[PDB]
Amino acid sequence: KTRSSRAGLQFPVGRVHRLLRKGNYAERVGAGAPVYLAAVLEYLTAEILELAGNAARDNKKTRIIPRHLQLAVRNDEELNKLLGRVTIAQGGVLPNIQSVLLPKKT
Amino acid sequence: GRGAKRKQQDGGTTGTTKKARSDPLFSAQRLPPHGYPLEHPFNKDGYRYILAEPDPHAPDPEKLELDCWAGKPIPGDLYRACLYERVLLALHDRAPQLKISDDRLTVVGEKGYSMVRASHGVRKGAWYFEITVDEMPPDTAARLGWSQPLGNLQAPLGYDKFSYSWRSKKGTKFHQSIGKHYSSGYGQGDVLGFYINLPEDTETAKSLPDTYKDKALIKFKSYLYFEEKDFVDKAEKSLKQTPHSEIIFYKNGVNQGVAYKDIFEGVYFPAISLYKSCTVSINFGPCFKYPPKDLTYRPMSDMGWGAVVEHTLADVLYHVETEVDGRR
Amino acid sequence: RYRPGTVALREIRRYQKSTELLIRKLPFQRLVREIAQDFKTDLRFQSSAVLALQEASEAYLVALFEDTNLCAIHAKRVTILPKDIQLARRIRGER
Amino acid sequence: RDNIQGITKPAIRRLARRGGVKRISGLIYEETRGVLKVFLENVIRDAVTYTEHAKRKTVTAMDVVYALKRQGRTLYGFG
Amino acid sequence: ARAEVHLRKSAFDMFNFLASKHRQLPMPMRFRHLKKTSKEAVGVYRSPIHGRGLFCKRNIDAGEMVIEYAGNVIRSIQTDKREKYYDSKGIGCYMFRIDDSEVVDATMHGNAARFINHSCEPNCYSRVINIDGQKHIVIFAMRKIYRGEELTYDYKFPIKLPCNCGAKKCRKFLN
Amino acid sequence: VDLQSLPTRAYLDQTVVPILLQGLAVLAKERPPNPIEFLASYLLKNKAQFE
Amino acid sequence: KVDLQSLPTRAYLDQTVVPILLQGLAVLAKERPPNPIEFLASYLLKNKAQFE
Ligand SMILES: Nc1ncnc2c1ncn2[C@@H]1O[C@H](CSCC[C@H](N)C(=O)O)[C@@H](O)[C@H]1O
Numbered sequence: 002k003t004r005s006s007r008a009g010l011q012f013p014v015g016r017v018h019r020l021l022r023k024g025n026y027a028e029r030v031g032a033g034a035p036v037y038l039a040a041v042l043e044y045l046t047a048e049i050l051e052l053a054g055n056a057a058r059d060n061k062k063t064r065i066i067p068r069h070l071q072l073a074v075r076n077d078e079e080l081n082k083l084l085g086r087v088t089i090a091q092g093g094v095l096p097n098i099q100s101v102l103l104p105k106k107t
Numbered sequence: 108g109r110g111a112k113r114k115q116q117d118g119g120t121t122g123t124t125k126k127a128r129s130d131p132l133f134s135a136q137r138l139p140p141h142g143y144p145l146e147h148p149f150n151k152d153g154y155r156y157i158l159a160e161p162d163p164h165a166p167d168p169e170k171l172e173l174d175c176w177a178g179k180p181i182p183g184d185l186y187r188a189c190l191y192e193r194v195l196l197a198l199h200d201r202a203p204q205l206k207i208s209d210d211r212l213t214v215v216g217e218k219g220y221s222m223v224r225a226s227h228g229v230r231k232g233a234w235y236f237e238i239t240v241d242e243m244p245p246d247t248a249a250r251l252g253w254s255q256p257l258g259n260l261q262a263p264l265g266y267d268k269f270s271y272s273w274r275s276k277k278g279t280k281f282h283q284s285i286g287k288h289y290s291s292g293y294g295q296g297d298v299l300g301f302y303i304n305l306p307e308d309t310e311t312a313k314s315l316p317d318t319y320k321d322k323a324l325i326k327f328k329s330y331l332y333f334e335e336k337d338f339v340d341k342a343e344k345s346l347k348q349t350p351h352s353e354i355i356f357y358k359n360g361v362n363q364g365v366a367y368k369d370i371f372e373g374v375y376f377p378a379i380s381l382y383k384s385c386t387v388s389i390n391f392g393p394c395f396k397y398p399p400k401d402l403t404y405r406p407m408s409d410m411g412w413g414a415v416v417e418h419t420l421a422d423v424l425y426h427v428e429t430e431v432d433g434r435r
Numbered sequence: 436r437y438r439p440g441t442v443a444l445r446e447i448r449r450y451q452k453s454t455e456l457l458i459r460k461l462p463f464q465r466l467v468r469e470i471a472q473d474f475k476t477d478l479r480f481q482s483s484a485v486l487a488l489q490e491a492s493e494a495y496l497v498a499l500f501e502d503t504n505l506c507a508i509h510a511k512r513v514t515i516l517p518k519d520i521q522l523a524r525r526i527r528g529e530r
Numbered sequence: 531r532d533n534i535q536g537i538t539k540p541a542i543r544r545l546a547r548r549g550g551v552k553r554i555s556g557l558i559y560e561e562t563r564g565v566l567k568v569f570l571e572n573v574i575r576d577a578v579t580y581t582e583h584a585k586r587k588t589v590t591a592m593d594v595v596y597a598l599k600r601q602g603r604t605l606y607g608f609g
Numbered sequence: 610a611r612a613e614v615h616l617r618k619s620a621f622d623m624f625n626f627l628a629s630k631h632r633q634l635p636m637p638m639r640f641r642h643l644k645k646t647s648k649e650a651v652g653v654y655r656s657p658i659h660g661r662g663l664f665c666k667r668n669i670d671a672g673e674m675v676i677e678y679a680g681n682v683i684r685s686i687q688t689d690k691r692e693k694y695y696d697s698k699g700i701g702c703y704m705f706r707i708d709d710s711e712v713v714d715a716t717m718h719g720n721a722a723r724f725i726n727h728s729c730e731p732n733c734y735s736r737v738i739n740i741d742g743q744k745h746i747v748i749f750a751m752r753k754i755y756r757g758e759e760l761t762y763d764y765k766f767p768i769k770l771p772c773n774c775g776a777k778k779c780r781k782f783l784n
Numbered sequence: 785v786d787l788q789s790l791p792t793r794a795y796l797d798q799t800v801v802p803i804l805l806q807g808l809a810v811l812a813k814e815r816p817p818n819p820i821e822f823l824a825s826y827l828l829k830n831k832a833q834f835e
Numbered sequence: 836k837v838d839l840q841s842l843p844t845r846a847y848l849d850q851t852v853v854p855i856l857l858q859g860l861a862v863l864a865k866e867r868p869p870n871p872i873e874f875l876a877s878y879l880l881k882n883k884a885q886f887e
């Protein structure tokens with residue numbers, strides 16, 4: 002019988018518990034730790050992937066290229082606070098031009 | 108030397124500007140994307156723009172390269188956007204919000220009010236034709252009946268004397284925004300018969316334009332359009348009565364009685380009026396029920412020499428007047 | 436064409452939209468080979484591995500440039516200068 | 531050998547375009563090459579340390595990411 | 610004082626909010642700012658030029674997308690009945706003609722931008738773009754917005770509804 | 785028909801379509817040596833199809 | 836020589852049978868006859884032997 006459906010989450014819980022048990026983070030763990038971790042990873046993954054899909058439909062492309070993920074992570078501010086010193090392969094950079102460097106004439 | 112194209116694109120000073128606006132859902136027309144038999148129903152009620160029956164023009168506008176239309180215009184043999192034998196409604200005096208099939212049998216309206224008119228008049232003979240209403244969703248008025256080209260193609264059927272209607276819902280007769288509870292309603296699967304009762308020869312008044320500058324010819328970007336436009340405030344004041352002045356809204360033989368009388372004197376076009384999205388099939392001609400009495404509504408879509416000769420005939424048909432007119 | 440400074444904006448925007456690498460494969464690979472030979476001899480590299488390093492470089496490098504940029508703005512000028520690069524390197528806390 | 535000249539003018543020009551500049555001096559390339567060389571040697575020191583500790587004379591990609599993580603940066607999408 | 614009849618009787622007013630206080634990047638994806646971060650920078654208060662107005666408690670500088678104007682978009686045939694009903698109910702000339710073929714009626718349906726005024730010394734100019742195949746009108750500013758001023762755009766009518774604003778350059782008319 | 789309620793050019797383009805079309809085509813492309821009987825037969829061949 | 840490269844077919848019919856067609860179209864547009872074949876034949880016989 003399964004264990005992920007007991008809480009209705011999607012990320013595995015048995016896998017998390019086994020990997021944390023063999024990860025020697027401590028010697029003895031409770032029962033709510035694996036389900037709680039599965040839940041928080043679920044929430045963070047959903048938070049990122051919703052913006053990923055929004056960026057995918059921005060350019061009208063079904064497949065999500067990593068550029069979309071880069072834009073979605075960078076344009077948000079809380080992510081930029083949490084993903085401070087992290088880069089992305091093939092990610093690129095969001096467009097930006099300094100304000101005072103903008104020529105004009107009549 | 109490159110300002111002529113910009114003048115042709117902005118609009119110039121030849122009457123109406125060279126920037127079309129037909130923002131409702133316009134379809135079933137404008138097939139060949141080049142200088143060939145074309146049509147542009149315009150937002151402005153009363154603008155008919157067509158390219159079939161072509162014509163040459165004077166070359167050398169501003170001493171640029173010699174234009175190919177100097178004395179020997181390029182030929183054309185392809186699809187022509189109209190009908191000859193018996194126009195199933197029309198393709199010229201229409202609103203740019205009506206969806207018609209390629210064979211021109213079904214009529215689908217806009218989110219708002221819409222109509223289709225025809226291009227064939229009736230003076231004598233039997234024209235016992237039918238309009239099979241395929242379906243009629245709620246809040247989709249399906250008033251059908253004859254009308255006049257002077258009628259505003261977006262005005263409600265019956266709003267002006269040019270147009271005559273019988274309401275599909277509750278059968279309440281409506282004309283000039285005046286309503287009387289008269290008959291019973293119609294709708295889904297209800298074929299509307301229509302036989303304008305003038306088997307005997309009559310007399311009417313056809314044309315009396317009031318404007319000329321809006322009737323001009325100039326290249327839009329790569330093709331010509333014929334600004335054949337109607338007016339309103341002058342046409343409505345030339346309103347007259349005529350013989351067999353009764354637009355009867357039958358029910359395929361059975362008739363509730365002609366709703367409104369004293370119809371406008373002029374060329375009659377059977378107008379089908381929709382109010383929302385709804386399809387409807389048609390069968391018009393000098394017949395009773397079967398469409399194939401004359402040639403069965405030829406589309407003139409063939410590659411043989413018949414298309415070539417008919418296109419050249421139309422070219423000459425307009426060439427006679429483009430030669431005898433004298434261009435400004 | 437003419438009017439210098441106009442083409443720069445078009446180029447920079449075009450490249451800002453794009454997201455490709457900027458260093459030719461073979462020269463960078465040979466340079467990594469040389470700097471590895473400096474440490475130890477006869478090291479077999481994974482084609483995936485080199486690529487890896489490559490990307491990281493630009494990341495680091497581009498960040499540095501941006502910083503120098505604003506430093507030039509602090510000096511009432513547009514052109515960036517070497518001295519600004521040492522400015523950024525020292526002020527970042529990585530000397 | 532001499533390959534530091536391999537990173538030529540147009541490439542560093544394009545990466546300056548990445549940075550957000552248009553006006554750059556002609557005497558900036560040498561110290562950029564120096565900074566780049568310093569970064570590469572600093573990373574590859576830890577890289578070769580990792581690859582030789584595991585007794586494998588080859589160099590993989592996952593250890594490169596490992597050294598990048600230990601240094602202070604982090605790389606995503608590779609291993 | 611309940612014994613003397615004071616004048617200015619007829620009003621024909623609809624938005625009964627008139628008070629004497631009035632205490633005030635690529636293109637397609639910018640849609641979010643229209644619906645979420647566009648409800649604080651502008652307040653609704655009593656305009657000094659004429660009638661009601663959209664005063665300001667925030668600041669917005671040049672070249673900044675601000676508001677999308679939406680209303681009951683109709684064709685030009687409904688203009689006749691609409692003007693007749695405007696005369697009947699006492700409705701102003703809300704015939705917002707984006708083009709000669711489609712007009713944005715604002716008497717049965719409309720947005721908060723129905724509160725604008727007209728003057729020959731305005732603060733903003735109009736602009737229109739196309740997103741996802743649909744033409745939408747979004748305004749980009751040319752200067753900075755101060756706290757306590759009213760948005761107004763030039764109608765650009767080529768030279769009888771007077772335009773009473775009091776500005777020196779005010780042509781006193783829609784022209 | 786053909787007099788008042790049917791415009792002259794509209795009558796040409798609407799009612800008698802299959803007769804003058806074929807005659808004009810044959811006299812502009814084929815031109816038989818004796819076209820009088822051809823045009824007479826074509827005119828008589830359309831008698832209960834158009835009013 | 837007819838309609839190969841020199842004279843376009845539309846231009847050919849606009850430049851080869853004019854003196855009969857303009858009269859025919861004028862009489863069908865003004866005299867409005869249901870049977871205008873007689874007029875066309877009469878104007879064709881006027882230049883039957885005059886056709887270059
Ligand atoms: N200062 C002014 N004086 C008179 N009419 C004005 C005006 N400014 C705008 N209008 C007209 O009023 C119409 C919009 S209704 C006016 C906005 C709103 N009712 C309010 O209270 O402010 C526009 O068509 C415009 O032509």
Ligand SMILES: [Zn+2]
Binds near residue numbers: 773
């Ligand atoms: Zn003023």
